[PDB]
Design a protein around this motif. Structure first.
Motif, PDB file in Angstrom:
ATOM      1  N   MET B  11      22.420  51.835  68.924  1.00 47.20           N
ATOM      2  CA  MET B  11      23.019  51.826  69.997  1.00 47.20           C
ATOM      3  C   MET B  11      23.681  53.165  70.027  1.00 47.20           C
ATOM      4  SD  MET B  11      25.010  48.555  71.082  1.00 47.20           S
ATOM      5  CE  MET B  11      25.146  49.390  72.849  1.00 47.20           C
ATOM      6  N   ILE B  12      24.165  53.645  69.104  1.00 47.84           N
ATOM      7  CA  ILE B  12      24.565  55.281  68.917  1.00 47.84           C
ATOM      8  C   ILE B  12      23.435  56.071  69.640  1.00 47.84           C
ATOM      9  CG2 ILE B  12      25.406  56.936  67.411  1.00 47.84           C
ATOM     10  CD1 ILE B  12      27.148  54.443  65.869  1.00 47.84           C
ATOM     11  N   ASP B  13      22.496  55.960  68.730  1.00 44.78           N
ATOM     12  CA  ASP B  13      21.468  56.945  69.128  1.00 44.78           C
ATOM     13  C   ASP B  13      21.106  56.944  70.609  1.00 44.78           C
ATOM     14  OD1 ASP B  13      21.273  57.225  66.460  1.00 44.78           O
ATOM     15  OD2 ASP B  13      19.122  57.259  66.233  1.00 44.78           O
ATOM     16  N   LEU B  16      23.707  58.797  72.412  1.00 50.20           N
ATOM     17  CA  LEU B  16      23.584  60.216  72.071  1.00 50.20           C
ATOM     18  C   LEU B  16      22.445  60.767  73.077  1.00 50.20           C
ATOM     19  CD1 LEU B  16      24.123  60.409  68.389  1.00 50.20           C
ATOM     20  CD2 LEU B  16      25.551  61.601  70.045  1.00 50.20           C
ATOM     21  N   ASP B  19      23.728  61.252  76.531  1.00 50.33           N
ATOM     22  CA  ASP B  19      24.264  62.286  76.649  1.00 50.33           C
ATOM     23  C   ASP B  19      23.486  63.641  76.748  1.00 50.33           C
ATOM     24  OD1 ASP B  19      26.616  60.872  77.079  1.00 50.33           O
ATOM     25  OD2 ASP B  19      27.444  61.126  74.994  1.00 50.33           O
TER      26      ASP B  19
END
Lengths: 264, 217, 338, 57, 10, 232
Positions: B11-13, B16, B19
């Motif tokens: 999820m963080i990937d 990122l 963004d």
């Protein structure tokens, strides 16, 4: 019968040279563009199409040159001819995509960041279409009774003629027109505004690309149109078999010239 | 086993990547100049944002930082352009501007970065030529070139002064840049409103030449 | 009496030089000429961390030797679990221009800073489950080059203001200010005991500082250009400096002198980062030539090379257990080596 | 004046630096070598540990 | 020759 | 940080109802959420799990298919739709947040719960004695046993301890057999050997009176044991 035995040797040496150049360029792209870029994607796709040509077309040419009758059978002919046509279409469409990408990069520079997505979709389309236009090869090729030919499939000569002309348009004419359009647009944009040396390089590159394309595919298709619009040229044996045997290799000549032209 | 941590990393990937997608299309510029130069008025740490034909421009003015500026200029080695503003009216400080321009042009990390030059305060330069505003350098030997394209109704003294200043800066430019970057001189004023268009055109040229190099055209 | 003070300063400098020369009876190369070389150090990229997009500017290891904070120019701190390469946290920053990052020894907080001239301390153990900005320290008048936690309530900072500071996070105030340098302070290293710390600046000089006294103790003046990186020897009696003039150097506090120079003719690019191994026998230095070198700290010979990065090696760190070495480069990738 | 104060501070700092007690460089080298030898067996990078004890492989 | 120029094996 | 659960009440067998949990005071989107159950005068029993991103869902074999778990991050609510019901679903339902990353503290916060009244490979946790008489000021040890070793190859013994005081929701005490949860007095300690574990309270107090439960987080069919009741 001698010129055929020469042809097989020229095809084998073309196999060797093309494999060497394609593999060398594929390795060298890891250094020239060690940072990943859309140019790397396009170049490796072109090398992939070229290797597919190298690994299917040449074996077919050698084997058929020796064994005049297509000893594999019927469905073998259908699928193998389909693969040959699909490989050549893939080469042509990928070079067209490269030309369009160069045109977009020079005429609309601000979009380079979006060029990795756009190129991707284009490539996919190309490949799919190269296997979508190749389907007729399955139907139109029938094994005959003392090789493999289309004489047993088309009902009238005009159908065969228009099919050959359709592959003419999709394989030679349309790539040539798109290449000329893109490169002349690039040249007129660059000449509209360092830049002198640049434009000299561009003219050299564009002229070499277009004229190498032309010389590679013009003898092949010259005999092509001759036969398609006038089959009797073969019944009267106006063309010696040596001339045909040598000329048809110009098509594969582009297989080895593509890596050198687009990879440097 | 804890697959939940891997899911959180995925999820963080995703966030990122989103963004990065959002930020990739923004064209970055570094505005640097003296205090006399009208840096702020050009666009109509300090961040500014503007648009031309729907391309985003993010302009950065460091403001309170180093003067050698060498420790921080490395942070801006991937910008599209360096906008350098020089107050043409001030003759005494024009050598300082030339030296700063030479510093920026020959910096190690800016060997690929092009410079968009704004010879600001042009009306003041016109007013100062007046007689008393003599020129400090050995300017007598210079006469306007045959290819001069003056703004209509420009007094010849004014046009030759303008071209002298531009020639000085472009001389500092060509003498040392090995063709990898190009300076784009422009004359501007306080009430000028076409500056964004000029930055747009210059940036389009920058990316066009970057592409020409990427393709070995 | 400006000339009188100038002459007094010159005489004091000559006295310092004479004392240093008197103390130099031998050289570390001669003394270590009988110690066995460390041999060829082969290190392989065991993990590669690929989340970042822009250039990596700093990284720091947690005291657990497992978690790792990295700061990138795209306005993003990432706290990774190196063992499993999965991202524990991704902190979005107000300012994208970050030149430093530090990990609290306790692991609760993490600091960052850069051209914003502010040091932002972020809390990780929030009951809300999200990393919040515990504080912003806003007393510097220059870019933030480095920062290092002493404990959860004290942080030391270096700025291009030509000054360093010791802060108090609870009150957000400069408890102490160190104002000796005459140039941009580019790096600092915190002593193992935390009593002292060294700082290297662009005046081609490093300085030793007492945290609680607030005064410079020694000034080391060997380099010929800016000192980008500084690190402490594991025992707190020496430190290694890496400068733009393609040269590292070793200084020992008690001798108050330079011991050895780690330079080679084939290296003409400056040192970005410097780090020691757990024993102190290896001096790992990142270089602007897209690659890192591993030096025999005692014999000055180059023992190895780490060559996986295709851009500037921006940052370099070694775990507290000496297990691995993390190098971050301008190519947006961190690599763990062992 | 500002210059006088700066010079006075500089000379005071130099005097503070001078009074420091220095040891011979030979003792410096000997102690660095001793620390390196004492903790040589605890450095994974210098002496590669077995692949089992290495958490990264 | 994707085409059938004779049966000339192709 | 507060989770308030709504729903509950009487239902005839075979009915259906949607329990909801309103979460207020934390980043709901960054947490996973568990539905746990407690039958009257009985222990705990994990029911369902929905992860952050709603990308992973798990159910107990006793509710698979009948129950579904969903979440609305935009308005911070967590739903459990129960489609078919029977007497064995009669219980107090709690909602438990659980955030997973290195060094995290899963199962840290619990809700107050909603009463709902209806008119073999799983790891088995055994807690030796139903109750233990205790006196204030002394030290007490609670024992737990697992059918399968909870020591994973990564060195984490995935045992968790909870304390349920009379009339309140469970509170986390230890989350990996050794780590003390935030806000828990130091007097609590936990040790283990991979299959037998012990929770020690150094000095009893009025707050320590209650039922202590053990849980395993090795295989996602999380299993609790019949807790030990410390009363005096």
């Amino acid at each position: 019968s001698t010129a055929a035995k020469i042809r097989v040797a020229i095809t084998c040496v073309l196999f060797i040279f093309s494999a060497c150049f394609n593999i060398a360029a594929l390795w060298t792209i890891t250094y020239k563009y060690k940072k990943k870029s859309h140019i790397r994607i396009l170049i490796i796709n072109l090398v992939a199409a070229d290797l597919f040509i190298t690994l299917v077309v040449m074996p077919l040419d050698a084997v058929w040159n020796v064994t005049l009758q297509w000893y594999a059978g019927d469905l073998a002919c259908r699928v193998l001819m389909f693969l040959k046509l699909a490989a050549m279409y893939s080469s042509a469409f990928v070079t067209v995509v490269i030309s369009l990408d160069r045109q977009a990069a020079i005429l609309n520079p601000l979009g380079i960041g979006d060029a990795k997505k756009k190129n991707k979709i284009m490539l996919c389309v190309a490949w799919f279409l190269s296997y979508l236009l190749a389907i007729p090869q399955l139907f139109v090729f029938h094994t005959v009774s003392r090789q493999c030919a289309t004489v047993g499939s088309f009902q009238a000569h005009w159908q065969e003629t228009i099919y050959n002309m359709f592959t003419f348009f999709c394989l030679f004419l349309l790539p040539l027109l798109i290449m000329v359009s893109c490169y002349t647009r690039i040249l007129m944009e660059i000449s509209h505004k360092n830049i002198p040396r640049a434009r000299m390089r561009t003219l050299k590159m564009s002229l070499v690309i277009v004229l190498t394309f032309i010389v590679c595919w013009t003898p092949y298709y010259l005999l092509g149109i001759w036969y398609w619009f006038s089959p009797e040229m073969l019944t009267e044996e106006k063309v010696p078999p040596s001339l045909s045997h040598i000329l048809f290799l110009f098509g594969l000549l582009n297989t080895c010239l593509d890596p050198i032209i687009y990879g440097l | 086993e804890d697959k939940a941590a891997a899911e959180r990393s995925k999820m963080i990937d995703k966030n990122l990547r989103e963004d990065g997608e959002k930020a990739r299309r923004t064209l970055r510029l570094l505005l640097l100049g003296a205090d006399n130069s009208g840096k702020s008025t050009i666009v109509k740490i300090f961040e500014t944002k503007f648009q031309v034909d729907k391309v985003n421009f993010h302009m950065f003015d460091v403001g309170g930082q180093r003067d050698e500026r060498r420790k921080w200029i490395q942070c801006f080695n991937d910008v599209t352009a360096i906008i350098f503003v020089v107050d043409s009216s001030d003759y005494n400080r024009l050598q300082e501007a030339l030296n700063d321009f030479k510093s920026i042009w020959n910096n190690r990390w800016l060997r690929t970065i092009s410079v968009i030059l704004f010879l600001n305060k042009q009306d003041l330069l016109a007013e100062k030529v007046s007689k008393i505003e003599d020129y400090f350098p050995e300017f007598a030997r210079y006469t306007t070139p045959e290819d001069a394209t003056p703004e209509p109704g420009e007094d010849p003294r004014v046009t030759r002064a303008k071209y002298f200043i531009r020639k000085e800066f472009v001389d500092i430019s060509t003498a040392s840049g090995d063709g990898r970057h190009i300076c784009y001189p422009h004359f501007t004023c306080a009430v000028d409103t076409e500056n964004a268009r000029r930055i747009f055109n210059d940036c389009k040229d920058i990316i066009l030449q970057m592409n020409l190099r990427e393709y070995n055209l | 009496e400006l000339d009188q003070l100038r002459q007094e300063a010159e005489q004091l400098k000559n006295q310092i030089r004479d004392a240093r020369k008197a103390c130099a009876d031998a050289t570390l190369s001669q003394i270590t000429n009988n110690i066995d070389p460390v041999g060829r150090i082969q290190m392989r990229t065991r993990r590669t961390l690929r989340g970042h997009l822009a250039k990596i500017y700093a990284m720091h290891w947690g005291t657990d030797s497992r978690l790792l904070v990295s700061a990138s120019q795209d306005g993003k701190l990432i706290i990774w679990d190196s063992y499993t390469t999965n991202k524990v946290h991704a902190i979005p920053l107000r300012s994208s221009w970050v030149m430093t990052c530090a990990y609290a020894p306790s692991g609760n907080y993490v600091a960052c800073g850069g051209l914003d001239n502010i040091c932002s301390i972020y809390n990780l153990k929030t009951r809300e489950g999200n990393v919040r900005v515990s504080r912003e320290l806003a007393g510097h008048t220059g870019y933030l080059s480095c920062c290092r936690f002493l404990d959860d309530n004290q942080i030391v900072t270096s700025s291009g203001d030509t000054t360093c500071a010791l802060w108090d996070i609870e009150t957000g105030q400069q408890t102490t200010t160190f104002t000796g340098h005459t140039g941009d302070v580019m790096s600092l290293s915190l002593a193992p005991d935390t009593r002292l710390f060294v700082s290297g600046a662009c005046d081609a000089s490093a300085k030793l500082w007492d945290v609680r006294e607030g005064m410079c103790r020694q000034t080391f003046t060997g380099h010929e250009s800016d000192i980008n990186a500084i690190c402490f020897f594991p025992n707190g009696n020496a430190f290694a400096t890496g400068s733009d003039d393609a040269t590292c150097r070793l200084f020992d506090l008690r001798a108050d002198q330079e011991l050895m120079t780690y330079s080679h003719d084939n290296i003409i690019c400056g040192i970005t980062s410097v780090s020691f191994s757990k024993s102190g026998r290896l001096l790992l230095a990142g270089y602007d030539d897209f690659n890192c070198n591993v030096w025999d700290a005692l014999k000055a010979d180059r023992a190895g090379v780490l060559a996986g990065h295709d851009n500037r090696v921006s940052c370099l760190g070694v775990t507290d257990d000496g297990m691995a070495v993390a190098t971050g480069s301008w190519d947006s990738f961190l690599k763990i080596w062992n | 004046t500002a210059s006088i104060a700066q010079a006075r501070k500089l000379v005071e700092q130099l005097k503070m630096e001078a009074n420091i007690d220095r040891i011979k460089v030979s003792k410096a080298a000997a102690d660095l070598m001793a620390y390196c030898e004492a903790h040589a067996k605890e450095d994974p990078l210098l002496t590669p540990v077995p692949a089992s004890e290495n958490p990264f492989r | 020759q994707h085409w059938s120029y004779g049966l000339r094996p192709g | 940080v507060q989770l308030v659960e709504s729903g509950g009440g009487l239902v005839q067998p075979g009915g259906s109802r949607k329990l909801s949990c309103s979460a207020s005071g934390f980043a709901f989107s960054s947490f996973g959420m568990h539905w746990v159950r407690q039958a009257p005068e009985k222990g705990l029993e994990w029911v369902a799990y929905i992860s952050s991103g709603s990308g992973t869902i798990y159910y107990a074999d006793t509710v698979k298919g009948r129950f579904t778990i969903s979440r609305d991050d935009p308005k911070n609510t967590l739903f459990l739709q129960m489609t078919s019901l029977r007497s064995e679903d009669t219980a107090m339902y709690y909602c438990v947040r659980s955030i997973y990353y290195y060094g995290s503290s899963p199962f840290d916060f619990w809700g107050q719960g909603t009463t709902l009244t209806v008119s073999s490979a799983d790891i088995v946790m055994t807690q030796a004695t139903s109750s233990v008489p205790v006196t204030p000021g002394e030290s007490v040890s609670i024992s737990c046993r697992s059918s399968k070793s909870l020591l994973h190859s990564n060195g984490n013994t995935y045992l968790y301890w909870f304390l349920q005081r009379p009339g309140q929701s469970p509170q986390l005490l230890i989350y990996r057999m050794s780590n003390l949860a935030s806000g828990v007095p130091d007097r609590f300690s936990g040790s283990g050997s991979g299959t037998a574990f012990t929770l020690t309270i150094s000095r009893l107090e009025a707050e320590d009176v209650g039922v202590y439960y053990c849980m395993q987080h090795l295989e996602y069919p999380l299993t609790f044991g019949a807790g030990t009741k410390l009363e005096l």
